[PDB]
Amino acid sequence: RFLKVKNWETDVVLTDTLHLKSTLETGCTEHICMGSIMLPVRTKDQLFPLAKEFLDQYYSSIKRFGSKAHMDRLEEVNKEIESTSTYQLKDTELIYGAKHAWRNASRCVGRIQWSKLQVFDARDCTTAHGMFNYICNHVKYATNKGNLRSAITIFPQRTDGKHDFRVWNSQLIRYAGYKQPDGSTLGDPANVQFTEICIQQGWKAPRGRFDVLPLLLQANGNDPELFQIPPELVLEVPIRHPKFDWFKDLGLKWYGLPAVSNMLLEIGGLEFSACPFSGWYMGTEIGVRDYCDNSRYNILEEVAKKMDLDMRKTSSLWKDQALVEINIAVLYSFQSDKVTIVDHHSATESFIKHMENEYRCRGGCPADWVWIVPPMSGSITPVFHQEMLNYRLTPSFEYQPDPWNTHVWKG
Amino acid sequence: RFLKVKNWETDVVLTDTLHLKSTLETGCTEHICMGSIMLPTKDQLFPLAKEFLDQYYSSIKRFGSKAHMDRLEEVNKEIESTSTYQLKDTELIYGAKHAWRNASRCVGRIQWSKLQVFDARDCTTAHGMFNYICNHVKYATNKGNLRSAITIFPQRTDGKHDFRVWNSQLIRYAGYKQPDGSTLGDPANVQFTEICIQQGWKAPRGRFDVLPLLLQANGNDPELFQIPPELVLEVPIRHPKFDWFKDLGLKWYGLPAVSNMLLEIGGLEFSACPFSGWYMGTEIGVRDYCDNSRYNILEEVAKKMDLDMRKTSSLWKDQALVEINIAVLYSFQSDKVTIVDHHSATESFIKHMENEYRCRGGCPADWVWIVPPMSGSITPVFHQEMLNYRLTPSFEYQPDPWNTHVW
Ligand code: HEM
Ligand code: HEM
């Protein structure tokens, strides 16, 4: 079965054969599309075919499919599974798997970078202090004084689900949120629940609008522990506008390194519940979502007042007008401080080229339109006009429940 | 099987039961979502008829009444006898309103119950069709105070007697391809503009030439007609701050009147069913004016604003896009032609969604189409989870007549 996608701006038509190699389900049925739904302990029984599928992929990629090295590896894994109920990936396999997880990430516009990913193998880690050390090294390497480098740090895989390694932070670097008795929120509202946990675990909160949260680290199924990332290692950028001089007086800044820490990485049936990764920001993640979402810093009103827009009717598009200037400021600030960032035009254009290349060399590129299209200026980016097929390949990054909902407290 | 949708900006969760009534297919499977793809007989007829009549009769609180049963029997007899059946006026109106109500891609559906339906099933000729359309256009335009309306021509019979409006909208600007290699007018309408000329239209070869109607009655060859200019309301586009903007020489028409869709009610097919409401600002300012395969005016506007078009990261395109959209809204409002901004309209749709979930058990919605083509996440719809599914009666797409017409 062949599937065609059309760009309605260029008339380019592409043919997907890659979806045929798809296992995991979508949420959709022939009777319903769930494409805008946000989120729609394993026996040796189901483990070997998953191992086999991965290893077959891996050996095809290195042009060794059916080799004695291929076969002996399958054999080796099969035995280790029946002997131990799990298995260990070679370093080469771990690296290949991590990259491909990113490559298969249908919601990620940044995938043109997928082959350049520094893999830090942290599978010898045993303690939270151990995890901290690893994470610090990740942040320093990835930050590279503003010349950002994509990296992932991979802690030991799940075993019985009772000894999980987890990073409790959703991102390695993120700002605290504090609920005030008057109902208002100080700092990042998205992080209120987590901030409370930290406080309850002993964190002494500065209680400001941009307090970098402590790391909360769980090793081997033990209770999590608090560590403060060395400030010298947290690269931040003050936000100013190139023409508006009052913009600095808004008091805004952001951190340079987006480093997602709460996902689960799946490689050949193996589950890596602690696998923080980092790249660099697309400008709109901050300028549109973090700053302008109503449930986030929500700065549109204050910006619009200072610009003196007509705020009495929405039909003045005062919101659209202010949203742009904020995004201009984010981009300007980062570039001025020589910290890696990409605008939504450059990133979407690069994605189209990537996606086209993937169709030619790979027979497809699964992609989630709802997530790929930027949260401002949608149709003036080329992805808006691009038909996309969404399906799930392995290796993959998966969501997992927040650890505080599941963690068995040792006390 | 009972599905919940969450708004992530408000945490509000709605439960969907309505989707269980879904009949048509989506194009999606458990293995692949096609959410972003633009277009994924007697024994066939009576179940369709019955399903429709069941819901019609349920809506007026006479489900399982004799008048219900009797109607079912009447239509059932009529299908057996005639191989088709005719809709009562009451049913035709309910059906059209519900087709709109079920249009999962329409953000304006809060207005769905207020639809003027023009029964044009007695129409036999293209001149006849022309008369009906002029009447429709004039009613709907209402001197700039737009009223929603649909005009319904006779239903399909044997597919060889189809009524068709060849235009995609009742009102649209012509597209001419230049020896210069560029495109004059609306590039989306180039092919249709040729077919007009192929049929004898005398093009003024301008940039904003209102296209002639190309009307097909009873399967016959289509005829050309010029909508009386006095009936075509247009708006010159000026900026409330930039004087030079008027010099760009842009205008647009006030009446969005989609004419190429197929209306299906109780199994019956209405292949000529032009309908109209009013514009959301982004339709003209973002898509019509700023799409690359359209009027594509960004560069020219940006120049006039003197923005740094050197690097993408000055967001000059974004800046212009805003201003262009401000001007469209400003122009329509100043002239008192009905228009809605993307903020007002999406907020309205959230309310409508709430109503539909509360009173009907849900509301099919296509997030990809509902979210406006600019400023997406500063509108409430962006943060709104939606379930897309197909309910009937419905508006469907259908092939362009020239690819089908046995001349
Ligand atoms: C290097 C520059 C990168 C850029 C500019 C980029 C850009 C983005 C953006 C804008 C999103 C949307 C996320 C949101 O809006 O919440 C995203 C999603 C995602 N990215 Fe990338 N990314 C980059 C690198 C990476 C790397 C290194 C990985 C993993 C190794 C990755 C994996 C993912 C995944 C799994 C998602 C989906 C997240 C979710 O479902 O919540 N990306 N990316
Ligand atoms: C009265 C105010 C209305 C507003 C503001 C409105 C708004 C919109 C918008 C923005 C779209 C997206 C289409 C595009 O971007 O090309 C749309 C689609 C659609 N509308 Fe509405 N509309 C209105 C009235 C109506 C009426 C009266 C009908 C039919 C009786 C209707 C039926 C539809 C259908 C079937 C679609 C999807 C068609 C397609 O897939 O191309 N709308 N509407």
Ligand SMILES: Nc1ccc2ccc(CNCCCc3cccnc3)cc2n1
């Ligand atoms: N620049 C980058 C690179 C990679 C990224 C990976 C993930 C994310 C953020 N994911 C958003 C999840 C937020 C959420 C909220 C509620 C329910 N599900 C998810 C950003 C990245 N940015």
Ligand SMILES: Nc1ccc2ccc(CNCCCc3cccnc3)cc2n1
């Ligand atoms: N304001 C309104 C109201 C109703 C509308 C109904 C339809 C449309 C536009 N339809 C766009 C179809 C575009 C297309 C192009 C190529 C292939 N298939 C579809 C606007 C409305 N606006």
Ligand SMILES: C[C@H](O)[C@H](O)[C@H]1CNc2nc(N)[nH]c(=O)c2N1
């Ligand atoms: C309901 C909807 O799926 C939700 O708002 C999505 C839409 N698209 C998105 N796209 C990106 N890149 N990031 C997001 O958080 C979201 N949120």
Ligand SMILES: C[C@H](O)[C@H](O)[C@H]1CNc2nc(N)[nH]c(=O)c2N1
């Ligand atoms: C590829 C994608 O489906 C296509 O660009 C869609 C996206 N969303 C849209 N949304 C609306 N309202 N109108 C459109 O024409 C489109 N086009």
Ligand SMILES: [Zn+2]
């Ligand atoms: Zn789907």
